[PDB]
Amino acid sequence: EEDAGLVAEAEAVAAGWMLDFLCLSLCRAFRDGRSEDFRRTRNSAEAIIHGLSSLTACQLRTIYICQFLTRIAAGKTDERITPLESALMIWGSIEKEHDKLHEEIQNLIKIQAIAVCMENGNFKEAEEVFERIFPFKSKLLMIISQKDTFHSFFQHFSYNHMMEKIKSYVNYVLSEKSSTFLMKAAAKVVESK
Amino acid sequence: EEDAGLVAEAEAVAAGWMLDFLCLSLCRAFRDGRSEDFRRTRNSAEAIIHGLSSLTACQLRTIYICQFLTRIAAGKTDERITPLESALMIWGSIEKEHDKLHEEIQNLIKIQAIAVCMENGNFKEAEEVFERIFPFKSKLLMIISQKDTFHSFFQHFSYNHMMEKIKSYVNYVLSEKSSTFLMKAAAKVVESK
Ligand SMILES: c1ccc(-c2noc(C3CCC3)n2)nc1
Ligand SMILES: c1ccc(-c2noc(C3CCC3)n2)nc1
Ligand SMILES: c1ccc(-c2noc(C3CCC3)n2)nc1
Ligand SMILES: c1ccc(-c2noc(C3CCC3)n2)nc1
């Protein structure tokens, strides 16, 4: 007396709910700097996403936000590019508006993809990252070439500035999803206690 | 204006809900013989379980049922024993009644832990499994020693019989959990469509 098709549909609705919940949790962990909680939530979101074979436009945006935050968190930490270069590719392909905040995050990631290699002492890789991404170019390459890690350009387009701008974007995702089914029902149980 | 403690509590309530949902899904996948769906649900349950640091008596039983089904599914197919020997250790330690069905499943696993090695042509391992687990003993060892894989003893304590008895136990878990929060709410959304 069990309809396998309706059971599979109920599991797909639940996977959709779990996906929103885990995106919300990943967003808060990234915002709060809770690295281990972020790693755990990311592993759970990655597994839950395998239970989905067809995704709506909203669900695709959700998984790409998750993948983007994952590469940003791996920034310092089957692809022959660095995590920040992979975050840059996701960022430019997400179905989202290219507003002032989008360009700021984009430019901050482009410079930090070079600066994190210099911070780690791998200047040959910083030049390779620069070549994959890029008069301004000749000056930026001269700065990398001279190992001028703390140049005022790198102090303006800093890692802290990249993280703050990404965190302000995360706040918009967090507010948009804070009302999703699973977190909303969980908060009511906690508030009733 | 956000209370981090109440957010962590809401995430713990949701992890508890996801755990029951994934146990239900793992049970149905095992029952239906949907190997790939089982592997996917197991990976999701394993990740979700990391989001829990304190478990109730009910939650511990749930994760041990999941671990038990996982070893049974890996039966053919950091521990120096076979998957069926690991299932046998979980089975004898779960907080559950040792009724007639429990002994039947236990004895079927003990013989199948030997017979799956013989089926795979590894008779030295079948003897090693036998030594770790065990006049009856001398006769069972003579059967392994003579590579008598299809002896009537092994035909009575068969793999199909072990799977059928485990599946009848899974039906009791499935009925006990079929009413849990997440699957119940998901079925209502599917029924309203
Ligand atoms: C300066 C400012 C913020 C941060 C930061 N925020 O989140 C994270 C990790 C993502 C997993 C935690 N780091 N790091 C440096
Ligand atoms: C190990 C390594 C990488 C990953 C990963 N990559 O992207 C994502 C997103 C969060 C869910 C989609 N996770 N997960 C586990
Ligand atoms: C005889 C009878 C039943 C079965 C069987 N049931 O479930 C499974 C796998 C657990 C993941 C699917 N196999 N195999 C042989
Ligand atoms: C890879 C290998 C093994 C496992 C695993 N072992 O036990 C379990 C149970 C289901 C959730 C608890 N999963 N998961 C993924």
Swiss-Prot record, chains A, B:
Annotated crosslink Glycyl lysine isopeptide (Lys-Gly) (interchain with G-Cter in SUMO2) location: 139
Annotated region described as TRFH mediates dimerization, given as residue ranges: 1-193
Outcome when changing residue 17 to P: Abolishes telomere binding
Phosphoserine: residues bearing it: 145
Induction details: Expression is tightly regulated during the cell cycle; levels are low in G1 and S phase and increase during G2 phase and mitosis.
Tissue note: Highly expressed and ubiquitous. Isoform Pin2 predominates.
Superkingdom to which the source organism belongs: Eukaryota
Subcellular location: Nucleus; Cytoplasm, Cytoskeleton, Spindle; Chromosome, Telomere
Processing and modification events after translation: Phosphorylated preferentially on Ser-145 in an ATM-dependent manner in response to ionizing DNA damage.
Task performed by this protein: Binds the telomeric double-stranded 5'-TTAGGG-3' repeat and negatively regulates telomere length. Involved in the regulation of the mitotic spindle. Component of the shelterin complex (telosome) that is involved in the regulation of telomere length and protection. Shelterin associates with arrays of double-stranded 5'-TTAGGG-3' repeats added by telomerase and protects chromosome ends; without its protective activity, telomeres are no longer hidden from the DNA damage surveillance and chromosome ends are inappropriately processed by DNA repair pathways.
Annotated domain remarks: The acidic N-terminal domain binds to the ankyrin repeats of TNKS1 and TNKS2. The C-terminal domain binds microtubules. The TRFH dimerization region mediates the interaction with TINF2.
Assembly and oligomerization: Homodimer; can contain both isoforms. Found in a complex with POT1; TINF2 and TNKS1. Interacts with ATM, TINF2, TNKS1, TNKS2, PINX1, NEK2 and MAPRE1. Component of the shelterin complex (telosome) composed of TERF1, TERF2, TINF2, TERF2IP ACD and POT1. Interacts with RLIM (via N-terminus). Interacts with FBXO4. Interaction with TINF2 protects against interaction with FBXO4 and subsequent polyubiquitination and proteasomal degradation. Interacts with GNL3L; this interaction promotes homodimerization. Interacts with TIN2. Interacts with RTEL1.
Protein name stated in the entry: Telomeric repeat-binding factor 1
Region of the whole protein represented: 61 to 267 of 439
